[PDB]
Amino acid sequence: MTFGTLYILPPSPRSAWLPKLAKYLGLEINVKSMLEVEDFKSKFPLGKAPAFEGSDGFRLTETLAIIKYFIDSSSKPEFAGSSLKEKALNEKWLSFANSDLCGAMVGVWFCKDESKKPELVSKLNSLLQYIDNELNNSKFLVGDSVLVADILLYVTLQHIVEIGVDISSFSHLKKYSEEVAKHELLAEAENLYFQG
């Protein structure tokens, strides 16, 4: 049965993160648009997506909050890491990717004005260069295992690429992005069964 209802802003490419994560974890959720709900602000007074309402009525906002609730409510409750340092670095990457990197991708994504684009694409490239460099040291963002940070990074990459930003310049990043797509595929059978 369904874990809850997620309210998104459909035009935003940030709308993909939480649905993907539910899927990855086997949580069945509805997804509605906050634009077409009558009293969004009755339930959610700030008026911003993402917003979630559990089946049980539990109301929750802020992307990082909802990530934690999905994971903690799921059958991979250790998916934001196990050791103290793992958990911390995963928070780091989640916070970074959701604010800075997604903020940059969205800047470009909705760029109407060509006199503003290069500046915006530049912010984005620097952020990618940083990640690339951090991927010098490690197999994935945090270590050797795949954590929720990677899943959501990967989704962000797909969006960045879709709009034609070369990930070709960034060596460690492309190799990363392949290794993550590979882990999900190989993890997919056992994941897909332990939720049915």
Features:
monomer, 196 residues, 2 domains, four-stranded mixed beta sheet, transferase activity, Thioredoxin-like_sf, transferase, Glutathione S-transferase, Glutathione_S-Trfase
Structural overview:
Helix content is 54%, strand content 9%. The protein has helices at 17-25, 40-43, 63-72, 84-109, 117-134, 148-162, 171-193, and strands spanning 4-8, 29-33, 51-54, 59-61. It has 196 residues and is of the alpha+beta class. The longest helix is centred in the middle third of the chain and has 26 residues, at 84-109. GO terms for molecular function: transferase activity. Residues 83-188 form the GST C-terminal domain. Pfam families: GST_C (PF00043), GST_N (PF02798).
Strand content: 5-15%
Tell me the name of the CATH class of the largest domain: Mainly Alpha
Query: How many structural domains?
Result: 2
The N- to C-terminal Cα distance equals 11 Å
Tell me the number of strands.
4
Morphology call? globular
- Rg, Å, rounded: 17 Å
Domain GST N-terminal: 2-78
Protein name: Glutathione S-transferase
GO cellular component, one term: nucleus
Pfam families: GST_C (PF00043), GST_N (PF02798)
Topology:
Blueprint: E1 4-8, H1 17-25, E2 29-33, H2 40-43, E3 51-54, E4 59-61, H3 63-72, H4 84-109, H5 117-134, H6 148-162, H7 171-193
Parallel strand pairs: 1-2
Antiparallel strand pairs: 1-3, 3-4
Protein name: Glutathione S-transferase
GO cellular component, one term: cytoplasm
GO molecular function: transferase activity
